[model samples]
Target: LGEYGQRFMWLWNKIHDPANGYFNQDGIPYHSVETLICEAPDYGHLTTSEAFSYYVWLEAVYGKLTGDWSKFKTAWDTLEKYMIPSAEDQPMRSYDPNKPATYAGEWETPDKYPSPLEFNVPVGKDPLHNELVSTYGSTLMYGMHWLMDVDNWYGYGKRGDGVSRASFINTFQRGPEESVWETVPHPSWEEFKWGGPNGFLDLFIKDQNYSKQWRYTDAPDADARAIQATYWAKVWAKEQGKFNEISSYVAKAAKMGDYLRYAMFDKYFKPLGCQDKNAAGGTGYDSAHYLLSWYYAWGGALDGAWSWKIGSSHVHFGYQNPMAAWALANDSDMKPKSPNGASDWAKSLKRQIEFYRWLQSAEGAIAGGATNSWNGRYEKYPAGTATFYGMAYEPNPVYHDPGSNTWFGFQAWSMQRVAEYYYVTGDKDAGALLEKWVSWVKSVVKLNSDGTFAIPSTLDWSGQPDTWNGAYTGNSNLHVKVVDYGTDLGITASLANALLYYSAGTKKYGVFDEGAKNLAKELLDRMWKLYRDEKGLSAPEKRADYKRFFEQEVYIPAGWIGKMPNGDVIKSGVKFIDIRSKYKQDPDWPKLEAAYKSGQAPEFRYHRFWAQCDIAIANATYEILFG
Candidate 1:
């Protein structure tokens, strides 16, 4: 994890529940190597794995930089673990590492679901599930193909198909609402029967009749549909004032995100976890304020949405520079050793910029407030608490709390904030330092069991598997809903991080510096590969063919999707290609049979965070070129 080697990220990335391709939902939060927040391969285990892709610098050209391309092979070695013979055609799930009791239950059934506590069969003897195919596991494979194969980093990872366009890109959808297991509670999906009524198949053909559809650029409507969606959205938005409308959409997006921020800060944050009985009232809501601070920066909290300590305080300026510097830098609240807490100051500035970066990757694209935290598991900010979505790879590796089993928490949002930090300081040394770290970050992406430059067949990078801590329960079936610790849409940040890596890798005042070009080629070669195809560019899945292709994510509740009050096919005023989407509610999952058999479509009903994550990849690509 420290400096060199690839065994950890490679091995860790391979083992997991295939359908989601994520390690145990909460078990392996982060790996041994400094990572973003972590979850475990075992349920509730508080271990995390850090990725170098978005964390380190100068890695845009690590292969050439190091002069030892063999490390690249070490990175590829992980393909041996996850890429099983069975996985060649589909997603591959693993045994329930937590419950030795249910270690033998079948992953699926005709009527009920695979469960824990009071439900299913044994673990080991259990048969692996199928739907997990086309999940995040393969998503990485897509990236690997791009990194080594398309770029010819080692002249090994390539497409024998004789195609020269470069590698293809992919990403996992951001949010999801699996109703198939509706018996599950708020964040716990341990309920009624069927192992997976995963909510990933209903939002395919959402004809917005007015202009263009939302999802389906790169990640959402995958393979070919991705390119189709981007090209179409561009054409439509352009001719019909769609981009202008998008400008308005941006404002609406701000308001909508603000609503989410308001709800969490006012009702959820403190009550749910922050101001618990153990640490509240007497100790000003420092934790609550911490979460709110980022909320204000990223979401749409312009003035006084809310703050932890003071009421009606125009607090957002705190993180920008002067205010946060005053509030935190000079304030006597900070602990020791962090005296020159310049890292915090610098990243704080960078986060403000990340808010505006509106970045993208092959799979996902983030728009704001990504890295509000750093220092995972660091005591400065109680580990395993706050859930910062956009926190980049290592800039915020979670620290292990005292007596805690493993590391699991962050100080801000993303590791990518370093980019903003560079902008603020303009300190060549700091930029170079961050650049080196970024290079390391990219290295994490090229993982391996033997700790080679690429992935290898054998290596146990799970990090002392049995001695798991108690933040969550150990359940191998744990599905990845919102990446409780790290980025639910990590890949998107990978792309955005790549952009920052390239920007920093360049020679200060030159025309397309070599490193900068490598960064561009990284995107052009790897990230972009996830998109382009014979038809040009494709998305991660095929909504038209698989339907579930667009079905993976549940859109964050908006007014337009899912079941309508009247249950009609279309909305009252909105225009749609078929007018059917107008009535779709965009709940966890909409009824797809109606659309598939008859070609009837929905509006934006039921698309969730994952939906946006899924769709953003291509949207970013299009914006990169046309916009």
Candidate 2:
């Protein structure tokens, strides 16, 4: 072990320290160790499935580096126990395959919601439910719910226990424009504890009657990344002759991949490009887009009256994972156990690659994605909008407060998967895409002499790809440009991993590229030398967006009356901080308050669980590949 290995262990021990606050009493990893920071999750104490998946990936890399498989097994076991919903959390005996869910149109803004649940609108039949239940001999879902309140901050515990540590929670149901500041956090297992009479149900959908029920949403990319991690763990364990030790875990991953296919279809199982709000439902697989969408949600009545599941109409380019698709389709040790799982994944693999090619801009960055329901309502698009299969192009498929595609992190994250796939198979298509993408990224990245570095922070996009006709053609119109740069440490680590994999792949495929490998080495070296801190490698990030807490209004339906667990008033015309007055008690609150008064941005070094894992994994990969 050298510096890289030492760095990995240092970060690992810090995260696992009981006083560090990364993991709660239930062993579930929090989004960050801090309490006041906000990004996708409004509270740093709340964890996302994305963090759990990264936790698994970190353990897998540890197994590869140290030849210890016990920690890896524990990580998976912990994830299954706490993150994935139990049978009682999701009872599906009353689910109807013909009518998956009631149709509720998504609105454009937060204030416009409580969108009516319209029964007259036709929704397509679910094609995978019966096959999934029959193949597994169970009615319960095998997927993980996306969000969890780790410390029970909202006071809604597991099934209203009110004192348990890790409770399921949800937010962001409004629409594309709703940012984290505008979201109203609610319990997934509603018991009428926190919000207006229906427990936050009436805030998102309007129905003649409301029942006490349970629901959950799955982030598909996180689940896919878990499968990808398992694939590598199996490969490395076999090389070390330790394959038998992890066989059971590998099979469990295969089962997870099996259920992941639910992410491949339309929201209501409607036709791929059905434009009519009142059109008849689709009957077969024509509704499947075969690309990983943003989410797949499922729920049932607490009294076992009925259950429903829904896939998303919007797909983001950032969520596509070709490596995971190939693993589920081809790897004998990792392929799904369901009857149609292998075939569906095989089709998805092809479609995902074609999607990448179709969306690739002339300068090499990928564009946003397409949506089955234009504007989330099956509304008509502008006459000349582009289509993939029949779905219309959306510059920002899911959210807009900060355009989903604007973050350069998406480019690094998605391309890293493609690089790994290319490294394994040396496929010509994957290699071609990487060649152009690597060139563009290198042009934008700057390695300064003072041991400082910068990578693309924000991106700008214009135009759309030509419609696909089942052929690979160049897209001159779809374009992307680097709008700004910053030292985002986690994203830089991901970009370095992509470059390292691409360099190794090119060499193996007889097109040796030393430039990429050299750049990757320099990136790891500079960050390690300059940014290493007591807890982990970190950079000071200024929270200019924190101003939104004071400036942005959180929408509450007029005349609705509610209270948070702490007795803060929930009503219309309130700013974000108004609903939860607990922020005033946070140690960092004074800093933010001063920033608000003086009009200055507050900066802090956040030790986010996912970012630390990314940095550690990048070092592990470098040590294994180069040494």
Candidate 3:
């Protein structure tokens, strides 16, 4: 991922364009995947629908990211009203009232793809769109992702659900889609021709249809996502007056929970789910039973599915562990509902953390798999095969231990979330365990006195002595260089966030060290510098375009002027400049400002949203600790 360069603030404004609800239209949100122009791919361009709302998690950390909540609140307002439409809207929901926050074709094509912009947009036409008609086939469960998060913010006093409890509940509680699949007249997608040559057999029963609108092939994160959503919904029920909504949300989530434990969870493979790329029924066939361990255990260590794969068992601690732990931890009701019978959030979290901790290497890096054949589809040990599992469903290449700290910073990301686990549940074991992981991060990254830090992508357990040790890339200015990349700053940022969250939660420096605060602030300051304007693009033409982008975004501070309770006049609900960090500014500020007035620049591989979120953690953690 390249730097935002001099166009940092320019791009920033375009992203937070409040003029029309964070993007081109008031209700539509842009996909962070691309943002190069005013069209679909541009930073300012809005997409028909987002693939995922992981940004919901980022929103929780917003105050820490920008040193305030104005932008966060503004976004919440937009998301609450627009993202979670009230009962009366039919574009994104069935208007059947049963399906709340269910898809009303807000952004689905017949194939569940994004639609192109329409040339002629109509007023009060609801969602703005173009050439092709949006699909209302299956509502993307992602709305649940954002809706649950909206409730989380409200629980923390952020407000902005723009609707009554029933209204908000209606957005996510369910619709026709959630009804029993087979019992419904057309139990499956019988009318849709099943989308492939496999025919009727390809149709599987979708309980709650987490991804029917889109699709979830292999990753069990759906179960995890549903679990967390249920947790938040429960919190709302307990706190908000909508006690009745809790049962419905929990019932839906528990159905997913049952799937996670029974279908996805493999007793021998450690609650792992695998996918086959091209099984007998043909490709896109997913089952926890596709034990082609070689194909499934792609990452080698412990992680969850990233995509549906024939030969890939991708695991991601960075993505799943944190939210899973947070959701489980906060659910006091779930204390008796743990899968392992520990009967508590702390114990359940500990059980999950132990798997990760068990994978921890001497260097403090936790091993996640690209492939680990401890046990799998292999029938017999080939000539030199490790006999780790058994044999091969198919002839494979040379075998080695697949478990290792494969993902650059995911394990650390887990640690950060677990740290929060410690705080929320007041569980010392989780805290102590988190401290060990944090210590490893500090020791492994080998942070220097000057604040520079380095981490290698792979930390192995292949009997290599230096497996835990990592080196800084020769070019510190670059990310994804050689073995290390810039976005890995996120891993470091996760550590910083863990530290600050730990400190703020416990009201102490850290359980492990007094320097936690200093370490966090220093690492964040340096991590963000790698992506900020100082190291960004600076060309005359770029500057001119940037100015145009900036002017377009901030043309109006607040769409409506209003008076504060003190009768103080307020122009904009939230200033775009503050979120963009446009104050008296830095040394590079002049160069970037001059360029912005004249030029423009745009720019991530971790997918734009993930990269953006990582940067947010770095900035927000710093602000909490030092700024």
Candidate 4:
């Protein structure tokens, strides 16, 4: 642990600069004289995900190795100042006031177009990725630090009051909701109505009626949007600072369940539901946060080696174990409704293990689903080659999608927690179970039709075929091959290397060693071949060709997709996989450029809010399992 600690510290120093309190994917040279340390500038005010979280992890590790708590305490005191405030306290911005300025037409409501720019930009530095990293990083840090501090193993170097247990709890007691998980928070991120007794989120939700989609019609979708607004806004603060969830002395820390649980809450559990999907209270997973809550209820301290078991800067088996364990333990009531994910959560501990284990597949293995949400199937999409990382039941790990497209960023690490789940539960059959799925996963991982490691662009590209009304097969197939990796069309799951590396290994099962070792060799070879630089392979960020390299950092796939809307999903066998109905978007171009810009009216069946999230599911799957 100490060896790992030293290695982590050295790497961490390179990532964060205490002055501005931010970590960067790009290097941060030095802190300004005015600032204490050199860190990356806050991009568009968004925070990074894992970088800062790694910083916090290092802090806890530092205290563990040297038995020194003094520096860490001081740092924590200073570090905690960067979190976002959940409650705005008063009306800040007016929505309708600035509206008329960016509206394209009737459907162009300001709430949806607060900034009037497309939410996602195909070719540019992605604000979301950077921000997601920050948010996740912050969460990891808080969770890990809390574990060490509570175990009593985290001692002060000088027996001073500053590093004592009492001070630690007292410090956390005053944290803000952004730092901690707020139960039923006061701040509701919103739209047009714009902040008032109804809350920020509510204001935005209320104004949906004025937008073209709402046009004063449904209630569910409007409420759902509010949830998404709140979700994305919080992420902005998360990216700004790793310790951004910190509390002030005068404040009553927002949520409970200790620091580690908050990490689970912020990273995976927090964004369970999106407004567009009409997800209200949020999405649920029985094992992740639910388990964490349960664990905190009984073993909040996590006991014994649990302190060291909390988190790791790189990829720590022990830390991942608890991360997923908590989720499984609490899977009872965690997800969005209309999507009907509650049953998914119902599987509880057993189901959690099933879900995670399903991620390890053969290289190039496909998911087994026959349909997906985007494909107009909510019940169960028959598994097949997942265009993204596929669903692993048995066989070499493969990629999969809900029949949306072939790639994207959202699902990267989407299925990672499977390995994490194995570690904490220590299920007796976990080893045998993983072994059962190994060959299948291996087949997928090793699949390269051209005798090259690079898989084809058509592999499991979009969501599963049209399976609405329980039609598992036969319909307008969504599988279509294309030329490029859909770059001009904008999409690439950047984190594929890390995910594959981590998922291939196991902390829970002893039998998995042999299979994981084999895959490990393949991964090492591919990583070396794909990402090695003068210093050796980079941490596998972008994709590489046989002789060339593509530095595109985008993660939205554009190959094949369900091409259908959520509301229309209820009907069966309609052959609606083409997104050409009312939108007329090129297979590789932006959905609406100036046509959507001018205040022109679209036809009746036009595509409103052509978001790329579903397409991202495939890429998300890739990153989740292989990134």
Candidate 5:
């Protein structure tokens, strides 16, 4: 253990401290320690599956440094117990594999939603449903829901228990344009309390009559990250001759990976590039994109009448995890027990690498992603659009407001997985991808004399990749340009980790690049020296976006009326902060209010749970690879 190791431990202890409020009473990690921050979740107290995965990852690094696997096992246990829905939580599945989910076309905006459920459209059979049921001997899903209201601020409570701390909640259901500010937070268990007659369900989907039901969506990247952490834990434990202690945890990871295969299939299981909405459902791998999509969702009627599951059609480049795919496919202990699980992942590993190659821009930065459904509806692509295995190329696949692929963090996060795959297997394909990506990243990074640094913040993308052929070919048209720069400590840590792994892999292959290694070291050192806070490393983020609280409109149907659990009225023509009056009670609310009054942006130093863990893990990766 050296300086990096010590830094990791310091952050770990701070996160675990009870007074820090990082963890709720139930031990689930909050997305961020502050309550005023908002990005994806709308509320800072809301926890995401992303944060839990990072918690598991942080502990895995701890195990590697200390040769103690207990903390690592405990982290997984906590994640499974709280994040994964209990059997009781999902009762009477009664799912039909042939007709997976009723069709509801995703619209362009929230006002365009309450999309009617169309039974006339053809839906695909779920190929893995029966196999998963037989292998697990249960109808219950083993995946984690993407979001949770850890503080019960929404007051929906856990299944009407009304007092549970960590209650399942969901937002962002409408469509790509429905940013966090426009979302209406409601319980996953639709209780008809928050929204109109049928609760939040009516806000997204319209039916002849509504039924109260329970639904959850899994973010594939988070679950895959958990499996990635488990792979490291198994490797490090075995190195210390302590594999026996973590074998069961390793098996659970394999099981999770088995269920994660759901992410590979198409929404409605329709054949890719089915431009016609009335097209027939696909059979076998015809529905499989073999790449992780935005989410895989499952739900059932409250009275056990029926159940449904649907995979996402949109595949973002940032969500791809070659490391997890490679591990599940190649590691005997990590290989899933389901009959075709390993084989599916084996295919996914190759397809994922191909995806990276296809999306790689001329400047070496990756462009957005592709989608089977153009504009979230299966509309025909304009005259001549590029296709990846029949999927149309999209500059931004899922969301549109801020452009899902614009943030540079996605580049660091996704490329880190590729780098890990390269480091572990010395795969030339992975190494080549890293070689180009790292070069572009280093060019954008700016090191200041005062020990502060700036990396790419927002990226502007143009053009589309040449439609993928079976053979590997360079993309000459797709391009990305760095439009902005900022000193984001968390993203800096992640970018540094990616560079370190790439440098280490190159060194292992006798193609050592001192420049890459040196840049990674400088980034890690400068960020730590300049921005170390008592809680964790952080930098002030100007909340210019927070102006959206008062400016961005939250669309509701003209006649519809409802109330939040706190008595905040929900009606037409309300702003983002209108229904979320709870912000007024937060300690940091004054700063935002002052900014609104003064016409200035409020700055916040947020200690987000996942970002802190990324910082700690970056430090540990540097120590392990180059110390």
Candidate 6:
């Protein structure tokens, strides 16, 4: 069998099988670009299409910064082969370039799941499958702007086939919802047919639970997609020097940004009346505001639902800053950018900044995930009744940070956004706030006494420490669970990269300097030691014989190897008998060691595709600061 499954970040989907779903044997370990490490697990062949787009950045940047295309080429070769969805995998995957009816695969059955509910089952082909289309077209178009090899952008040049650059952009340029196939008319689904606004609800809910119940678009979520489109559209326009060509994209970008700032953040939060419930109310946001998650379909009104457990304003930080920065870079006024809501963009970010700032202790530690309403809330409102269990304003962000007292990797990610804001616009306030947060991180978050920065995969971001691990000083009374790569790469490596990005070509300052450089070297070097090289990819392995040091990766396993294909059992060599892993007692253990010289009996859980690329990113950061 070829290589069937592919691993990206925490994703482990069966990518291919020679057995035609019989043996589920290996074909090729593909890549995925969903960005969030592991939200919805088993959406198919998307690993390649999405991964191709995301890796475009990695490959291009890796080459540009490192002067080494060897690793980039290794990854790029796989992407070049596998990027298109239906052409290679199946139809209706969101990565589809032309077909919108099948764009999200709403009608497609989630293979492992059982049958549907009574009235809840979709009528014709469910419109929800178009979920893939929501963020697909525009983001791919945006991704193309940065790719090193524009010719084979999506692993397919414009052969008039899959989602090539022109087709992808043109599809979105025309309208994302335009379908090649008619929206197979249905009574319950007429309003959600193709040619409507594009957005896909998360598949876990859309497929498992009542699809319609959870089917609502989010502001920052939708707006982030728009921002990606807008940023690249302007770049393309500038490159072409045809300002008129991108006018529509520009206008759309502006509208989306303003909507996020005004309609999404302000209008949604201002009316929540959460003052004294969550926190002291701010000027524009309710103190209890949980950064409203979803909008009801009827009027697309805020239903006060927060998603991904505790409703995060932090996740969108990755793209939102660039959205604002790009808008400001093009024009100072809101008319061309977020027109009528000019101040809204800055104010919205500022309000979130204020929420984070409010959590800052005098010692500089900051908290995240306020209003953990999912666990339990202080007050459950009537207006919030549209959700699964109705919305409530919980004092804690979620079960993790009880009483809203502690923070998680959410703080690291958010601080990176603030750093970017300061980097681009030189916002003095954002800069100062970022510096203080960095101080808290360096001092409070447990770093190994060694030169290496032991950035907890997950730990309290507040001034008080030692809540979870006795390693720190005070009792934080907070939750702690470090998911290996996502947390390690996301928190520690991500923070380092953000600081590196901010300080590039300028004087080194603020939480990243010579010490940071040494610590980073130690951290990066240490991470590499854990990898037993196979196929030039750093295959992850949990230390079985020894204690794994500084190994907090958010959510993803430290090193996971799957069950062998040929009915051979294997293990990551750890004592724990993971269903995903093989044991030392497996018969064909020698073959595993030959693949990767791991100490324990290793299965072919070969590559940390995302981790390998991220390590390259970490090295790229190292080169920026020191090289």
lDDT of 3 by residue, 1-627 (tens): 122221223334433556423333343344433233221122222222121233434443433232333443444445434443232222122221111111111111111211232222211111101101132223222122222212121111112223222111101111112211111011111112222222111222212222322111223443353354345445545554544634544544443333233212221222122222111221111212222111110100012112121222223344344445446444545432434322233333544554444434444454442222112221122343211111122111112212223345555555665665565566665665566556656655556676556655554333211211122112121112124433355456666777766655555434435566667766665655554432221111122233333443221122333322112332333332322332224334455465565544522222233344445544544453444
Score candidate 6 by lDDT. Answer: 0.32
- Cα RMSD, model 6: 14.8
lDDT of 3 at 206: 18
| lDDT to native, each model | 0.23, 0.88, 0.34, 0.24, 0.89, 0.32
Candidates sorted by lDDT, descending order? 5, 2, 3, 6, 4, 1
| Weakest ten-residue segment in model 6 by summed lDDT | 167-176
Which prediction has more favorable TM-score, 2 or 6? Answer: 2
TM-score of each: 0.28, 0.98, 0.45, 0.35, 0.98, 0.46
* Stronger candidate by TM-score (1 vs 6): 6
Q: Which tens-of-lDDT digit does each residue in 1-627 have in candidate 4?
A: 333233334333422334332322222111111111101211111222122222233343344334444433433333343221111211112212111111111112222211222222111111122232243333122211121111111121111222322112101111111011111111111221211232222212223323211000011111111122222222223344323342221011111112223222211121221112122212222113222121110111111111111110011011222222333234222222212222222333353343333332222222332111121101122345332111112111111111222332222222223333344345544443444434333443432544234322333433333322311232234322222332211112122322333344453234335445444444433433443223111222121210100111111112211211111221112221111122222221232232234433221110001011111222222332333
lDDT of 1 by residue, 1-627 (tens): 221123122222232223332222212212211111112211111111122111111111222222333332232223222111112211212313122121111112211222222223211210111111122223111211101111211111112122221211111111111221111111001111111122111121121121110111111001111111222232334444434432332222122221212211211122212222222221212222222232111101112221111111111211222222222322232211222332343333343332222221111211112122222111133344223332222111111111111111110123333343343345443354345434433433332244222211111111111111322222222111111222212233233433443354344422333443344334333433343322122233212432432332323223333321123222223222122232233232344455555665422211121212222322233233222
Is 2 or 3 the stronger prediction by TM-score? 2
Candidate 6, residues 167-286, lDDT tens digits: the string is: 111110111121211111111111222211211122111234222211112324334433433443344345545445445445544544443432232111222433222332223233
Report the candidate with higher TM-score, 4 versus 5. 5
Q: Write the per-residue lDDT of candidate 2 for residues 199-279, one digit (tens) a residue.
A: 889999999999989999999999999999999999989999999999988987888888888899999998888887788
Per-residue error for 34 in candidate 5, Å, reads: 0.8
Which residue runs of candidate 2 sit more than 4 Å off their true CA positions? none
Q: By TM-score, rank the candidates, best first.
A: 5, 2, 6, 3, 4, 1
* Per-residue lDDT value at 283 in model 5: 82
